[PDB]
């Protein structure tokens, strides 16, 4: 059992409901920040202090929902273009969590002074799905989710070519090996086969340079 | 300029978020135009199959080559994009959307479990350019949210549609819970607060993402 929080200004993306698929074994609430704000206009972001382009998203407002939301024992994850890579490894190790909160940025970014107040009472993870950018962790939040709920109890190289019936389509047919039989002749070719495909399309995974 | 993404997947509500993520203005202007598609009307039987049993062995299903030929068949012309999003794929970067950015008719085939047939991308590049691409190093269940990214990714690159690390931002007020903002920034001194900023990207780099150096 485990549960998951998540906290955006746009609250309505979040909303699927693959991830969706349970019996109860993790719980997923979803919360809009502006639910922390006091005055009338419902301010979340200001100006850069030092100049620059874009707004960012002020501290208060974000350190009064985390005090409800977050407890000791919580993981906190920031999605952010600046952050340490999010691997496989990664999933594997928050799929043994009993609490994770992400915190959905929007602008140009969050007051750092947020998560370095959060690092004092809970840990906390500042963390990139990609090497791009986005206008929101919102879609992060979900393929963190993704990536991590399919892993939870209860539920290397390349992997090559797959098929399946018909033998033979628009005059294309399926490798003869795989009709054979052979369970050894068809791990070896779908070895090399999986081996072939790394070396062309991510050659930095068996330590080569990067095209 | 004047864009249009279609979607075919076997989940077309997940697509929710995207066409309700758009400005209405562009929308007029014809920036863009996203069209979800439920993999299932291409289907031939009574029970609507989408995969079946993978030849060779093995767990997991794979993906009709039939159903999904009769669907790019249907969507594809021949300046047509096609986008499939996978683990074993290419990387999909920054440099990715941007070139992706300037494309006409982009259409992302989502796939689910282990994959469609192979053939199916095979025979779609005798007609189209094909980029099968992965956002990351890590397997998801299907293809969805994959989708959502690299359709977020490339629009925020469209004008009027929606290297080091950046290092922290700060904004008011000046103090809050004991920590105080770097007093450099409110200094006035624009060619000390580029360097200083400078070093605090280099320091980021260095700890969170020693590839790049
Ligand atoms: O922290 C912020 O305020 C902020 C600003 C812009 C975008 C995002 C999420 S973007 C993302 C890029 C790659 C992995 S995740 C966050």
Do not use: C
């Given at each position: 059992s485990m549960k998951i929080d998540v906290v955006t200004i746009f609250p309505e993306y979040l909303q699927p409901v693959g991830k969706a698929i349970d019996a109860g074994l993790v719980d997923v609430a979803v919360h809009d920040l502006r639910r922390w704000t006091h005055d009338v206009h419902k301010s979340v972001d200001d100006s850069p202090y030092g100049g620059g382009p874009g707004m960012v998203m002020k501290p208060t407002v974000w350190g009064d929902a985390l005090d409800e939301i977050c407890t000791s024992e919580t993981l906190l994850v920031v999605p952010t273009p600046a952050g340490y890579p999010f691997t496989q490894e990664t999933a594997w190790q928050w799929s043994t969590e009993?609490?994770?909160?992400?915190?959905c940025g929007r602008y140009e970014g969050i007051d750092q002074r947020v998560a370095d107040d959060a690092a004092t009472?809970?840990?906390?993870?500042?963390?990139?799905?990609?090497?791009?950018?986005?206008?929101?962790?919102?879609?992060?939040?979900?393929?963190?989710?993704?990536?991590?709920?399919?892993?939870?109890?209860?539920?290397?190289?390349?992997?090559?070519?797959?098929?399946?019936?018909?033998?033979?389509?628009?005059?294309?047919?399926?490798?003869?090996?795989?009709?054979?039989?052979?369970?050894?002749?068809?791990?070896?070719?779908?070895?090399?086969?999986?081996?072939?495909?790394?070396?062309?399309?991510?050659?930095?995974?068996?330590?080569?340079?990067?095209?």
């Open positions: 009993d609490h994770l909160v992400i915190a009472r809970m840990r906390v993870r500042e963390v990139s799905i990609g090497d791009y950018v986005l206008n929101g962790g919102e879609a992060a939040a979900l393929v963190i989710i993704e990536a991590v709920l399919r892993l939870v109890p209860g539920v290397s190289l390349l992997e090559g070519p797959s098929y399946t019936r018909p033998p033979s389509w628009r005059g294309m047919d399926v490798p003869p090996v795989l009709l054979s039989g052979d369970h050894a002749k068809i791990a070896a070719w779908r070895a090399e086969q999986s081996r072939q495909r790394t070396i062309e399309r991510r050659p930095d995974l068996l330590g080569f340079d990067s095209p």
